[PDB]
Symmetry: C3
Subunit: 31 residues, 3 copies
């Protein structure tokens, strides 16, 4: 059960860092 | 303790999915 | 182990909430957008 939780958190941490990059690009008008 | 964590992870999982869809829209129209 | 999950989860909540604010601001064009 906590092993399953840990995989879920690892994937969230990934999705969230990708979201952070996308949102910063949008905020800053990057590129 | 663990059950409470499971609730928090589900809540986060849902919010991140909504974020992904909205950000994706934002990148198009 | 479980203590570590709990801190990771807490971090995520702060970041996810920051992301929602930013994304809503972008979507509604708040404060010039």
């Amino acid at each position: 059960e906590v092993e399953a939780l840990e995989k879920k958190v690892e994937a969230l941490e990934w999705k969230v860092q990708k979201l952070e990059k996308k949102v910063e690009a949008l905020e800053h008008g990057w590129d």
